[PDB]
Amino acid sequence: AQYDISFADVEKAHINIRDSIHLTPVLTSSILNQLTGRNLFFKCELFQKTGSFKIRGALNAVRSLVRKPKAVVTHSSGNHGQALTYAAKLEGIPAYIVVPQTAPDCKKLAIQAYGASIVYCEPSDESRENVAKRVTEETEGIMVHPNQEPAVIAGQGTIALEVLNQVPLVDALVVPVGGGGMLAGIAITVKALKPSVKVYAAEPSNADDCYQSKLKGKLMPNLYPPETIADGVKSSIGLNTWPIIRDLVDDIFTVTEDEIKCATQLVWERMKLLIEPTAGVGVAAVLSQHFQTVSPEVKNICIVLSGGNVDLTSSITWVKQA
Amino acid sequence: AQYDISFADVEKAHINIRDSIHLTPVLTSSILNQLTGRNLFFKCELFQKTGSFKIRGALNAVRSLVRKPKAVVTHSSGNHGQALTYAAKLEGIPAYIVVPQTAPDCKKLAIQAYGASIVYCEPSDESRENVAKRVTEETEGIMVHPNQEPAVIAGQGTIALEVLNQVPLVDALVVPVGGGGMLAGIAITVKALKPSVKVYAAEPSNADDCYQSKLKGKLMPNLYPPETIADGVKSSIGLNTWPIIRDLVDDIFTVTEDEIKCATQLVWERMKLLIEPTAGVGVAAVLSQHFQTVSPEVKNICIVLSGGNVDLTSSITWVKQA
Numbered sequence: 001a002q003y004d005i006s007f008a009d010v011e012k013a014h015i016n017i018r019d020s021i022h023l024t025p026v027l028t029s030s031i032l033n034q035l036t037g038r039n040l041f042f043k044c045e046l047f048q049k050t051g052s053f054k055i056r057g058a059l060n061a062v063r064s065l066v067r068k069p070k071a072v073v074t075h076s077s078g079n080h081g082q083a084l085t086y087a088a089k090l091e092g093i094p095a096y097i098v099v100p101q102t103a104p105d106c107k108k109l110a111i112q113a114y115g116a117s118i119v120y121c122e123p124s125d126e127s128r129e130n131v132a133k134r135v136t137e138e139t140e141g142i143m144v145h146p147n148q149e150p151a152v153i154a155g156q157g158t159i160a161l162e163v164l165n166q167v168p169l170v171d172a173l174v175v176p177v178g179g180g181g182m183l184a185g186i187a188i189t190v191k192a193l194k195p196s197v198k199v200y201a202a203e204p205s206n207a208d209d210c211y212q213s214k215l216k217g218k219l220m221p222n223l224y225p226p227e228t229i230a231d232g233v234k235s236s237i238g239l240n241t242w243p244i245i246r247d248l249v250d251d252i253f254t255v256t257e258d259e260i261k262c263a264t265q266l267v268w269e270r271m272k273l274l275i276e277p278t279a280g281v282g283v284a285a286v287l288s289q290h291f292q293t294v295s296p297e298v299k300n301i302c303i304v305l306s307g308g309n310v311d312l313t314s315s316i317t318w319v320k321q322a
Numbered sequence: 323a324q325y326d327i328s329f330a331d332v333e334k335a336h337i338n339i340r341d342s343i344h345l346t347p348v349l350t351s352s353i354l355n356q357l358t359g360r361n362l363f364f365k366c367e368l369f370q371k372t373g374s375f376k377i378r379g380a381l382n383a384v385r386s387l388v389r390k391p392k393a394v395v396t397h398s399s400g401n402h403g404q405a406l407t408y409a410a411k412l413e414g415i416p417a418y419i420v421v422p423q424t425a426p427d428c429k430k431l432a433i434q435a436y437g438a439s440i441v442y443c444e445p446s447d448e449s450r451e452n453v454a455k456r457v458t459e460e461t462e463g464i465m466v467h468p469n470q471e472p473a474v475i476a477g478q479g480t481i482a483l484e485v486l487n488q489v490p491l492v493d494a495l496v497v498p499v500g501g502g503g504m505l506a507g508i509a510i511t512v513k514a515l516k517p518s519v520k521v522y523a524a525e526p527s528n529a530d531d532c533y534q535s536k537l538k539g540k541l542m543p544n545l546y547p548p549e550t551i552a553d554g555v556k557s558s559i560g561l562n563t564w565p566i567i568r569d570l571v572d573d574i575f576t577v578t579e580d581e582i583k584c585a586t587q588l589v590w591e592r593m594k595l596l597i598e599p600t601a602g603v604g605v606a607a608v609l610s611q612h613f614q615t616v617s618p619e620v621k622n623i624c625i626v627l628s629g630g631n632v633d634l635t636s637s638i639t640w641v642k643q644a
């Protein structure tokens with residue numbers, strides 16, 4: 001009944017960011033329709049400013065602060081970091097981004113290109129959170145969490161406002177899940193406007209905390225730091241997004257590393273959209289064996305292609321020839 | 323005054339193919355605007371059916387035949403071959419595609435995937451033309467030339483009808499040139515509707531026959547088979563497209579291999595559009611030193627991103643890390 005955001009927060013966020021973001025297109029694919037037997041629609045957040053949907057939450061959070069702040073601080077595998085740095089730069093606010101050592105080089109470099117101070121941490125939720133806390137204290141900055149901050153969650157939710165308008169007959173949204181900010185914002189939004197529309201999460205089997213949490217009915221974070229090509233969804237879900245996910249998300253589909261790699265390459269080759277592997281997670285979910293159990297009434301499915309920030313040099317390892 | 327096609331042919335082609343092709347989007351890039359000091363618009367033919375704009379000419383040609391034909395035949399580095407095979411398959415007509423031995427593997431495989439009989443030839447204009455002639459005779463098929471066939475040229479020209487509608491304030495179109503079918507169709511169209519709009523060709527320095535022809539005022543085909551990463555524009559311009567290009571194209575910009583590689587990678591990384599290197603030729607042209615000499619009045623420039631059929635495995639060689 002009462003969560004850390006409401007639909008009204010999402011509506012407000014949309015008005016406050018729409019002049020500063022792209023109304024990204026919804027594209028289709030005949031081959032992917034044929035492979036799934038569904039009518040698919042691809043929400044192209046890879047074309048968003050900074051290369052992912054994270055600009056939505058970042059702009060909303062920075063503008064929700066509006067003496068100006070001394071600094072903004074966060075932890076990020078890269079996309080929220082880039083987005084926050086860009087949003088903060090527009091207001092003349094310096095940014096400190098705490099980033100795991102094992103984040104992709106392209107993401108590390110982009111954060112530095114936008115002028116942030118990058119601070120490497122160890123690759124775990126605990127290290128990300130603890131180092132961001134220390135950096136926040138040292139800089140006397142403002143922490144803008146990548147997925148648990150209400151202003152961030154409300155910003156990500158605005159994706160659903162656009163999808164429901166662009167695909168008026170949509171039956172389901174499929175959303176990749178890491179910390180659950182996007183999934184939670186979208187769930188709040190869809191279930192407020194047209195709750196008959198399904199909200200499905202897609203998650204790596206190698207980082208399956210959201211799936212485990214829903215199964216067990218309690219928050220079950222990753223016990224070991226995840227090893228996955230879906231580098232942007234290694235975070236566990238958190239205390240603010242869990243209750244929304246528990247109550248408002250219809251199902252969660254897990255996908256293996258091989259499935260993620262295959263779906264990502266299929267989008268590259270067939271749609272010509274350079275999605276990052278994390279964005280391939282949603283595509284893998286709809287292609288998966290378990291998704292065939294979804295009712296045939298759920299025909300019009302919109303998959304969020306959440307980002308396009310991929311290391312081309314690092315992607316030469318897993319790319320397979322036909 | 324009188325060329326092998328007219329504007330009326332392009333208009334007719336558009337009505338005859340529009341129900342069967344995508345009205346591809348026009349996208350923008352802030353970074354590419356910043357780099358060029360121009361206002362750029364990208365016509366996304368990479369999203370077209372079969373991965374390039376060639377579906378336009380192919381559908382128009384196949385439907386311009388409408389006992390049904392025994393077979394269709396062509397020569398192609400891959401894109402026209404794929405498009406022709408698809409168009410012919412819709413009508414239950416078999417296809418024989420003559421393809422140079424050194425065409426990219428992805429293109430060879432796609433032609434076979436669409437059900438064509440592929441016939442390898444030696445990598446030269448002479449071999450392509452001679453083998454297609456022999457195959458046409460042996461199969462008693464109909465030759466559909468990739469760039470000199472009027473129905474094909476008229477089909478490619480329809481790109482300009484869309485661009486002029488989608489970018490109403492456009493000042494110039496930039497078009498990659500191989501055989502000159504697209505360039506000629508676009509030139510006929512633009513100069514009929516709003517001749518103040520510039521039509522610029524973009525060409526590899528390593529395959530610079532169009533540039534040489536315009537300089538010398540006569541058709542000067544490539545003396546040696548071109549060596550270029552822009553694998554789809556190795557053909558010389560021909561007898562039907564040359565007069566149109568001579569008279570109606572405003573300038574031709576050549577770009578080196580390094581420029582093509584750099585522009586292609588920039589589009590991948592910054593726009594998240596998986597263009598093939600041939601489609602990077604137009605982007606390289608607007609980024610080139612010589613394009614800076616174009617009048618500052620030519621502000622709104624639409625570049626045709628002509629195709630997305632790229633060998634990912636073969637592209638691991640030239641991709642450079644930042």
Ligand SMILES: *Cc1c(COP(=O)(O)O)cnc(C)c1O
Pocket residue numbers: 052053054079080146147156176177178179180181182183232233235276278279306307308
């Ligand atoms: C952040 C991100 C996600 C996951 O969003 P959460 O709010 O962390 O669940 C998915 N894809 C991409 C590209 C992202 O950057």
Ligand SMILES: *Cc1c(COP(=O)(O)O)cnc(C)c1O
Pocket residue numbers: 374375376401402468469478498499500501502503504505554555557598600601628629630
């Ligand atoms: C065919 C083609 C061109 C060139 O068109 P021509 O009519 O041969 O000049 C450019 N880019 C791509 C991707 C093509 O397939």
Ligand SMILES: [Mn+2]
Pocket residue numbers: 177178203204207208209210233234235236237
């Ligand atoms: Mn997870």
Ligand SMILES: [Mn+2]
Pocket residue numbers: 499500525526529530531532555556557558559
């Ligand atoms: Mn040439």
